[PDB]
Design an enzyme around this catalytic site. Structure first.
Site, mmCIF file in Angstrom:
data_model
loop_
_atom_site.group_PDB
_atom_site.id
_atom_site.type_symbol
_atom_site.label_atom_id
_atom_site.label_comp_id
_atom_site.label_asym_id
_atom_site.label_seq_id
_atom_site.Cartn_x
_atom_site.Cartn_y
_atom_site.Cartn_z
ATOM 1 N N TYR A 207 0.870 -1.200 0.000
ATOM 2 C CA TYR A 207 0.000 0.000 0.000
ATOM 3 C C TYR A 207 0.892 1.231 0.000
ATOM 4 C CZ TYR A 207 -3.418 3.503 1.559
ATOM 5 O OH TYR A 207 -4.203 4.612 1.657
ATOM 6 N N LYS B 138 1.518 4.649 -2.411
ATOM 7 C CA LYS B 138 1.401 6.044 -1.938
ATOM 8 C C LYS B 138 2.670 6.784 -2.364
ATOM 9 C CE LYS B 138 -1.719 7.446 0.171
ATOM 10 N NZ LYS B 138 -2.955 8.075 -0.329
#
Ligand SMILES: NC(=O)c1ccc[n+]([C@@H]2O[C@H](COP(=O)([O-])OP(=O)(O)OC[C@H]3O[C@@H](n4cnc5c(N)ncnc54)[C@H](O)[C@@H]3O)[C@@H](O)[C@H]2O)c1
Ligand SMILES: NC(=O)c1ccc[n+]([C@@H]2O[C@H](COP(=O)([O-])OP(=O)(O)OC[C@H]3O[C@@H](n4cnc5c(N)ncnc54)[C@H](O)[C@@H]3O)[C@@H](O)[C@H]2O)c1
Lengths: 212, 211
Positions: B122, B126
């Site tokens: 994740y 980002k």
């Protein structure tokens, strides 16, 4: 002596808090202050002027980390005092630190310090000169490391973050941070910074801000 | 144009708070999201996926600022979904932003981005999201971009450089002392946007939120 530190200004609001958490982390704590506080049995308390070499020196013998969070009150508007203690007196803390073989000194600065080139008053002016003295003293090859932690009308909400890999930061473990209030937070950052300074000497001579 | 703006992920937890506050400063606010969330009488809602060129354009058509705080759930553990939305998707948001004469994009990043090379898939997306958007900054083309990095291994302290290289944003805390953590994070997003249209050199930089 690896678990031995002095807290300069250890009787004060921030100091007392520092003492609580240092004791709780299995540190042997000396307290240096010009006022005797609520007696804590588990603390070698020394009384004295941080401007005095004669006063300071014995409280520093055997200690590896000094915590400087002593100050006159910003509200007093006593300029000669701010000048005497924040600015002049600070040269005593550093030189007495070297004399005694202290290996780390952690200064409590101000967040208004970030305004160096209406929030700049004379107190802030002394605290800048303070931070500049303390972080100039950083000498890793002599094994003398310093940093400044900067807690807080006008406040920096956002701070720029370097993408060039130059930005240093201090990691905490969230499980120990949730039930901690504002000051316990500020205090915690001081202790983590100091612990991570023996593990990573490249934090010396930087200034840090807190988050959340 | 001057005071119109779009929150992408405006139905989100953070979204809802962003929208409350822009409105309070008298912004005309568009929300764009894949779910409709809570009806707001003062808010134009456009349903859609932020990846879809066609869905989005009308939601940016004629607005001047864009707050991107849309993200798939971090708990899901869908390597492909994360990459799809945070990288490929964001790259679209930047396209149609320019195709719509939008002047300012303010991404909401992750404070966890700082942990690079020291840490989820994740978080890696980002990282790609952030450098895409800061990559897109172009002041000579009237398209300023900025990223704000809101916060188990958590960062406590952050170096402040003394040589004037770093930039900060002033807030009059006198009046944001009665805010919650989120209300402050948001207030950060607004201040950044507001001051990004007084000093362009905040373009291309990522920012952290202080005490
Ligand atoms: N705690 C915070 O959140 C906060 C916020 C901003 C700034 N600060 C910084 O923290 C420090 C003050 O924190 P505080 O609220 O605990 O202050 P305080 O006034 O409660 O205590 C400071 C301590 O310094 C001691 N001291 C003063 N002069 C001394 C001297 N000459 N010799 C030895 N000891 C001396 C005092 O006796 C006192 O115990 C300053 O450096 C200040 O700028 C604190
Ligand atoms: N505020 C906090 O507490 C906090 C803490 C850490 C990080 N963050 C950051 O905040 C951001 C948003 O968090 P949140 O809690 O508001 O999320 P949320 O899940 O509450 O809302 C995000 C919104 O994105 C929308 N969205 C998802 N995929 C979309 C797509 N393809 N097209 C359009 N819209 C789409 C969803 O419908 C949702 O409404 C994240 O980017 C995250 O990094 C939040």
């Amino acid at each position: 002596q690896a678990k031995r530190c002095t807290v300069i200004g250890g009787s004060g609001f921030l100091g007392q808090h520092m003492v609580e958490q240092l004791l709780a982390r299995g540190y042997a704590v000396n307290v240096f202050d010009i006022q005797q506080g609520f007696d804590n049995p588990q603390v070698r308390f020394f009384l004295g002027d941080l401007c005095s070499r004669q006063d300071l020196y014995p409280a520093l013998k055997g200690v590896n980390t000094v915590f400087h969070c002593a100050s006159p009150p910003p509200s007093s508007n006593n300029k000669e005092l701010f000048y005497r203690v924040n600015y002049i007196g600070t040269k005593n803390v550093i030189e007495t630190c070297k004399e005694a073989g202290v290996q780390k000194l952690i200064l409590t600065s101000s967040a208004s310090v970030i305004f160096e080139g209406k929030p700049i008053d004379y107190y802030t002016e002394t605290k800048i000169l303070q931070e500049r003295a303390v972080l100039g003293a950083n000498d890793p090859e002599k094994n003398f490391l310093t940093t400044a932690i900067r807690p807080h009308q006008l406040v920096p909400i956002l701070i720029e973050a370097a993408r060039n890999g130059k930005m240093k930061f201090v990691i905490g473990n969230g499980k120990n941070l949730v039930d901690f209030t504002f000051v316990e937070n500020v205090v915690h950052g001081h202790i983590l910074a100091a612990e991570q300074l023996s593990r990573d000497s490249t934090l010396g001579g930087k200034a840090f801000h807190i988050l959340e």
